[PDB]
Amino acid sequence: SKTFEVNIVLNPNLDQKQLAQAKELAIKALKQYGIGVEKIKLIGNAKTVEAVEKLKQGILLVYQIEAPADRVNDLARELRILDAVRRVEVTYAAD
Structure with a gap:
């Protein structure tokens, strides 16, 4: 029942x-x-x-999502593989 907070830029x-x-x-x-x-x-800040040169506007969508930690590899993999997403971070949050 792990909950991870995902920071997507x-x-x-x-x-x-x-x-x-x-x-x-x-x-x-x-x-x-x-x-x-x-x-x-x-x-948005x-x-x-x-x-940051082009992201002075801070286009960062945060998704706090509860799901098993086994799929964190695919989480970041499928987000980072995108040419539409600049940066992807995954930090564990309160369950």
Whole structure:
């Protein structure tokens, strides 16, 4: 019943609706991880990122999702493999 908080930073080279395509691509991969208790926090001030040059707006979608830790590899794999997501971090949160 592990709960992981996923920090997803979207590719700055996308349009405003291609960021929603990246959101849906993220959610796809996020669902591949699991579909347990979910809390969506779209952070719009988290400029902190390698590509801060183009991500001064801090396009960082947070998904706090409960699911087994066995699939954390596929979680980050399926999120990071995207050319629509700039950066993906996975930090364990309160169950």
